[PDB]
Amino acid sequence: MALPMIVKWGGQEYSVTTLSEDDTVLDLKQFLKTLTGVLPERQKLLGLKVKGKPAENDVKLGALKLKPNTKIMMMGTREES
């Protein structure tokens, strides 16, 4: 599942929000893989974006309606490339 949370791994601090209703998780997804390109490779989040079963694109703000208060944390998300 893709919850609208914010990632701040010290050096790297991105935004894993759900975006506007008009948009979708698929959008940010491409922006994350293109900006970090580490999520689709290796990562250890507290729960957001699990391996062996990544969130779906159908997921949207109107489908989550969550808040950023969740605060997501990333671990071992460095490729140095």
Instruction: Name all domains of the chain by residue range, CATH numbers in brackets.
Output: 1-81 (3.10.20.90)
Q: If you ran DSSP here, which 8-state letter would residue 49 be given?
A: S
What is the C-alpha separation between 15 and 4, in angstroms, rounded?
8
User: What SS3 state is found at 44?
Assistant: coil
Quote the radius of gyration of the chain (alpha carbons, Å): 12
3-state secondary structure string across 11-38: CEEEEECCCCCCCCHHHHHHHHHHHCCC
